[PDB]
Design an enzyme around this catalytic site. Structure first.
Site, PDB file in Angstrom:
ATOM      1  N   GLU A  50      23.182   8.619  33.565  1.00 37.42           N
ATOM      2  CA  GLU A  50      23.594   9.426  34.524  1.00 37.42           C
ATOM      3  C   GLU A  50      24.673   8.480  35.554  1.00 37.42           C
ATOM      4  O   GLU A  50      25.313   9.283  36.497  1.00 37.42           O
ATOM      5  CB  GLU A  50      22.379  10.025  35.368  1.00 37.42           C
ATOM      6  CG  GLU A  50      21.383   9.141  36.065  1.00 37.42           C
ATOM      7  CD  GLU A  50      20.266  10.114  36.609  1.00 37.42           C
ATOM      8  OE1 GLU A  50      19.840  11.051  35.978  1.00 37.42           O
ATOM      9  OE2 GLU A  50      19.718   9.568  37.622  1.00 37.42           O
ATOM     10  N   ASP A  88      21.431  15.705  40.324  1.00 35.34           N
ATOM     11  CA  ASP A  88      21.625  14.467  39.759  1.00 35.34           C
ATOM     12  C   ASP A  88      22.571  13.610  40.772  1.00 35.34           C
ATOM     13  O   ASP A  88      22.173  12.672  41.114  1.00 35.34           O
ATOM     14  CB  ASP A  88      22.118  14.762  38.359  1.00 35.34           C
ATOM     15  CG  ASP A  88      21.056  15.105  37.482  1.00 35.34           C
ATOM     16  OD1 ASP A  88      19.996  14.935  37.685  1.00 35.34           O
ATOM     17  OD2 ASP A  88      21.336  15.917  36.573  1.00 35.34           O
ATOM     18  N   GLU A 101      25.677  17.624  37.530  1.00 36.64           N
ATOM     19  CA  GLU A 101      24.278  17.573  37.010  1.00 36.64           C
ATOM     20  C   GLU A 101      24.802  16.915  35.484  1.00 36.64           C
ATOM     21  O   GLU A 101      25.655  17.744  34.802  1.00 36.64           O
ATOM     22  CB  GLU A 101      23.664  18.835  36.644  1.00 36.64           C
ATOM     23  CG  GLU A 101      23.240  19.326  38.158  1.00 36.64           C
ATOM     24  CD  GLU A 101      22.469  18.569  38.978  1.00 36.64           C
ATOM     25  OE1 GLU A 101      21.184  18.629  38.892  1.00 36.64           O
ATOM     26  OE2 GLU A 101      22.847  18.165  39.980  1.00 36.64           O
ATOM     27  N   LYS A 114      22.369  23.424  26.688  1.00 34.64           N
ATOM     28  CA  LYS A 114      22.148  22.957  27.983  1.00 34.64           C
ATOM     29  C   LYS A 114      23.259  23.161  28.934  1.00 34.64           C
ATOM     30  O   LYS A 114      23.086  23.467  30.268  1.00 34.64           O
ATOM     31  CB  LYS A 114      21.878  21.274  27.803  1.00 34.64           C
ATOM     32  CG  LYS A 114      21.473  20.619  29.133  1.00 34.64           C
ATOM     33  CD  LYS A 114      20.177  21.085  29.608  1.00 34.64           C
ATOM     34  CE  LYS A 114      19.935  20.441  30.876  1.00 34.64           C
ATOM     35  NZ  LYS A 114      18.548  20.840  31.678  1.00 34.64           N
TER      36      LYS A 114
END
Ligand SMILES: [Mn+2]
Lengths: 144, 415
Positions: A50, A88, A101, A114
């Protein structure tokens, strides 16, 4: 532990680019117990993924994992009683917000599943934040 | 102006049909000190973008853009491992435990749409990836089973040619022709019929005689029975915003009388067209085989049939003037109606002209189908470059000259 110490030795080819990288690295190396290491190994790998994904796009990493309400209340902005959601990556400038995200899915079907779920759960927030507050622009970074 | 607060708050969707044009024209030309600036200011630095946009809209003829820019300028818009480990990259939605109604990853969600046809618009169903793969493994199994089948004519050109030649000889001989067209084939069938059919069957192996168990097929067919379809939104605003209609009445009965607005439709009998073609094909084939066997054993007259999953043709070879057999035809219609195979009133059951897949056959020759091909040639100018267009025109003209149209006409098409 034929592979545990092997994993510890071979994960040494990592660059501590950010402070939290070393912060999690030292905790991982100073903890050898059967129950945690898989959990924090998965979480550190996800944090690395991430981080790459978001500083690919001018990130401000969420090291506190706090809600949108508190980060919007950090400066002077009224609370519209926004529904809770954990972001995020966030970047607020003036009276604008950029939300990112990210996730990883090796199979396509789960990837678009997702993607659609995240897109749906980020679109509904605009209808509330715009009524008595500021905007946002939701960006989704999906990696196969 | 204030009515946007109670109504939708989006200023970009405000319709101009609610206010007069004179008021809009005169209102934008009122006093405005800090909302406009002098000059066009082509450089456009950050911080004064609204003022530049208002000036650019005002210098132009249109004022609606100026009106909405003024509106937006005025600020009128004001340690467990199963719960804390499902948010970083864990694929919680992976299919691992399934019930008869779902797959732990959705409910086979579908979307409705249209496709234009010459007569009337044709239904169309679009599937998400998961339901697409599921219905597509059903498709593959069903084409396999139908490839084992012999009399089907949907994707085997050899059997189609056999049916054509049998039809031609039949017409030349004086055979009894029955061109059956089935009405509402799509929206009438239900998956539960396929469930019962596959439960009652055995599907014996070629050499093993092992009686293959179709448990996965049954489970996925139950999934298809439990599919949910999402209504197009456009009709949702069309009906909500607001002639007597039954569906409009159902909508007017179901916004708040029972629950919320209808957005997902769920029922028993859908059999989405374009999704279960070949399973319905095999079901219709075996049912028609049963009906022709019954006709043979009852009326001692020899049937043959060909089926295309939407329409069929039956040739009746007769022993030993055509008015003594209405009774068996009514009987066959009754038995077909007992099954889920209602016959449209467009069927013709005599012995002078035969129809199948819009290819008529008559005593002696075949219809040329001229004007259909001519109109097709005139239409469908799929233009990207002149070369591909010449190629497509050549192919269409070859198809046209195949069915004996003319050669003084293709010259005119070329011109
Ligand atoms: Mn027909």
């Amino acid at each position: 532990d034929e592979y545990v110490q092997e994993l510890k030795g071979l994960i040494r080819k990592h660059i501590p680019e950010r402070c939290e990288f070393g912060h999690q690295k030292v905790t991982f190396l100073s903890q050898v117990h059967p129950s945690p290491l898989l959990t924090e190994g998965f979480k550190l790998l996800s944090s690395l993924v991430e981080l790459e994904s978001c500083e690919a796009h001018a990130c401000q990493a969420n090291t506190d994992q706090r809600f949108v309400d508190v980060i919007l209340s950090d400066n002077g902005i009224l609370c519209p009683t926004l529904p809770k959601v954990i972001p995020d990556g966030f970047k607020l400038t003036g009276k604008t917000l950029i939300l990112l995200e990210t996730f990883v899915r090796v199979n396509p079907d789960e990837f678009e599943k997702k993607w659609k779920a995240d897109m749906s759960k980020l679109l509904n927030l605009k209808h509330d934040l715009q009524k008595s507050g500021v905007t946002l622009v939701p960006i989704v970074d999906g990696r196969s | 102006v204030s009515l946007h607060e109670v109504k939708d708050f989006d200023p970009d969707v405000l319709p101009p049909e609610v206010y007069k044009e004179l008021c809009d024209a005169v209102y934008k030309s009122s006093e405005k000190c800090n909302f406009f600036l002098e000059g066009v200011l082509d450089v456009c630095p950050l911080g004064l973008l609204l003022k530049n946009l208002t000036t650019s809209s005002y210098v132009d003829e249109e004022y609606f853009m100026c009106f909405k820019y003024l509106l937006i300028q005025g600020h009128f818009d004001q340690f467990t491992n199963a719960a804390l480990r499902n948010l970083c990259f864990y694929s919680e939605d992976s299919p691992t435990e399934f019930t008869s109604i779902s797959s732990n990853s959705g409910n086979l969600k579908f979307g409705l749409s249209y496709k234009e046809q010459v007569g009337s618009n044709r239904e169309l169903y679009v599937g998400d990836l998961n339901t697409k793969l599921m219905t597509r493994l059903v498709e593959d199994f069903s084409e396999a089973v139908g490839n084992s089948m012999k009399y089907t004519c949907l994707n085997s050109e050899k059997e189609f040619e056999r049916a054509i030649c049998d039809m031609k000889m039949a017409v030349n001989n004086g055979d009894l022709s029955c061109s059956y067209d089935h009405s509402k084939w799509g929206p009438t069938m239900s998956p539960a019929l396929f469930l019962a059919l596959l439960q009652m069957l055995e599907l014996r192996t070629p050499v093993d005689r092992s009686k293959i168990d179709l448990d996965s097929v049954k489970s996925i067919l139950k999934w298809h029975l439990h599919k949910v379809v999402e209504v197009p939104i456009n009709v949702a605003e069309a009906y909500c915003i607001g002639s007597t209609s039954l569906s409009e009445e159902f909508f007017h009965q179901t916004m708040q009388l029972n629950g919320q607005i209808p957005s997902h439709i769920m029922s028993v009998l859908d059999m989405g067209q374009g999704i279960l073609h070949n399973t319905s094909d095999l079901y219709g084939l075996i049912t028609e085989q049963f009906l022709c066997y019954a006709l043979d054993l009852l009326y001692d007259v020899i049937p043959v049939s060909y089926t295309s999953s939407d329409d069929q043709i039956t040739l009746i070879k007769t022993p030993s003037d055509a008015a003594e057999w209405l009774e068996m035809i009514c009987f066959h219609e009754f038995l077909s109606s007992k099954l889920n195979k209602f016959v449209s009133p467009k069927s013709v059951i005599g012995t002078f002209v035969a129809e199948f897949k819009s290819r008529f056959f008559v005593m002696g020759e075949e219809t040329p189908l001229l004007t259909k091909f001519v109109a097709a040639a005139l239409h469908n100018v799929k233009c990207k470059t002149p070369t591909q267009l010449s190629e497509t025109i050549d192919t269409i003209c070859d198809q046209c000259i195949a069915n004996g149209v003319s050669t003084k006409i293709v010259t005119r098409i070329s011109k």
